[PDB]
Ligand binder design. Structure first.
Ligand SMILES: CCC(=O)Nc1ccc2[nH]c(=O)n(C3CCN(Cc4ccc(-c5ncc(CO)cc5-c5ccccc5)cc4)CC3)c2c1
Length: 383
């Protein structure tokens, strides 16, 4: 359980596509971690950084002496692009990485679904809204290029996985209670009670992913939250890695500081996201927002988060801890992880086993008759 290789690499930023020097550790457990400076040295390894079941590619574009680690994590293809000064070093890194990966080695068809809407396109495939002909139920289908290659109440479940000759297809449930940004904008702001409920269920799902699955979600934002027919949260998994837009990938309003800086990150990234999401629910606006990306980054990195006079002291305490710039200081960034949030005064009185078991009654019931009611898909209502 030790280091197989370490040294400086040039890593391309995941959201700001610039080259940055980072000190990377390769460990026999499969973790490939990069730090801004050489670390003096959470202990539970995170699969986000694992090299297990990845393929290594050597390329001379966009830059010479580049190598790429490509991994399928759950239903998303992930790439990490690195550059070294010499081809001899690139060969050292790839073989070392490859050896570690080798050491860790030890019907339904497309015709059953009706294509409805394109939800998103990515470098390695697309996501479409479909309806199973037999049931009338709605699903998101991730169609990924084959060439490139459990269950929780509040995560969108992966139901079917099947293949074509050139595509790999993941079929996951699509909640029909409406997008959470659609509900928040309609009602402007949520009461602290209502935000506590959605917040509680998110904490429950994040606790599962961190403890049981040892994975950081890293994508927690309002756009990835939906309500099912009963009004419970569903965190979505409809994402696909895209080439940036000239070059920044997506929008940064929700990104944790340590993620923006391409620095070492862990489970604390999701608590930031929780803070971003709960700040907007209870305040009616994003914490940091400015059109200049140079300013948005500074705002996220530098500007101290401000609160409205309407927020209670408990809510202000929770948001302040969640939105601490430094993850080591952030609420939930310690070894207790999710327990720090659960035991917070803002969640006093919440029985956390009742949360996992959907015992808490939703404060808002979406106006749908069943799991197949298409109200929140209808154009007339969505506007
Ligand atoms: C600018 C555009 C772009 O390209 N962004 C980008 C680039 C590189 C990335 N590398 C990166 O890891 N992510 C990130 C990679 C993907 N996460 C999203 C994610 C993270 C974990 C699971 C997940 N897992 C395991 C289990 C069970 O076992 C269950 C789930 C699950 C299921 C249902 C709902 C919720 C979670 C599912 C999605 C967040 C993003 C990257 C993103």
């Amino acid at each position: 359980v030790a280091i197989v290789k370490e040294g400086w690499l040039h890593k391309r930023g995941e959201y700001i596509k610039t080259w940055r020097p980072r000190y990377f550790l390769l460990k026999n457990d499969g973790t490939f971690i990069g730090y801004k400076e050489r670390p003096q040295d959470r202990e539970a390894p995170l699969n986000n950084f694992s090299v297990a079941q990845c393929q290594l590619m050597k390329t001379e574009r966009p830059r010479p002496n580049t190598f790429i680690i490509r991994c399928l994590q759950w239903t998303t293809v992930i790439e990490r692009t690195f550059h070294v000064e010499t081809p001899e070093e690139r060969e050292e890194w790839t073989t070392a990485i490859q050896t570690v990966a080798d050491g860790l080695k030890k019907r339904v068809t497309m015709n059953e679904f009706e294509y409805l809407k394109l939800l998103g396109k990515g470098t390695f495939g697309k996501v479409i809204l479909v309806k199973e002909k037999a049931t009338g139920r709605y699903y998101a289908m991730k169609i990924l290029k084959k060439e490139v290659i459990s269950r929780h109440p509040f995560l969108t479940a992966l139901k079917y996985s099947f293949q074509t000759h050139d595509r790999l297809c993941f079929v996951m449930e699509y909640a029909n209670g409406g997008e959470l940004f659609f509900h928040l904008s309609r009602e402007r702001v949520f009461s602290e009670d209502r935000a506590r409920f959605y917040g509680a269920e998110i904490v429950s799902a994040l606790d599962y992913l961190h403890s049981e699955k040892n994975v950081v979600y890293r994508d927690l934002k309002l756009e990835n939250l939906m309500l099912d027919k009963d009004g419970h949260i569903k965190i979505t998994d409809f994402g696909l890695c895209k080439e940036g837009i000239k070059t920044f990938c997506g929008t940064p309003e929700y990104l944790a500081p340590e993620v923006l800086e391409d620095n070492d990150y862990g489970r604390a990234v999701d608590w930031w996201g929780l803070g971003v999401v709960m700040y907007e629910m209870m305040c009616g606006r994003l914490p940091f927002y400015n059109q200049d990306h140079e300013k948005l980054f500074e705002l996220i990195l530098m500007e101290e988060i401000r609160f409205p006079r309407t927020l209670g002291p408990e809510a202000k305490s929770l948001l302040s801890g969640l939105l601490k710039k430094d993850p080591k200081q952030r609420l939930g960034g310690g070894s207790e992880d999710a327990k720090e949030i659960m035991q917070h005064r803002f969640f006093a009185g919440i029985v956390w086993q009742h949360v996992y078991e959907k015992k808490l009654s939703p404060p808002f019931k979406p106006q749908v008759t069943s799991e197949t009611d298409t109200r929140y898909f209808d154009e007339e209502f969505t506007a």
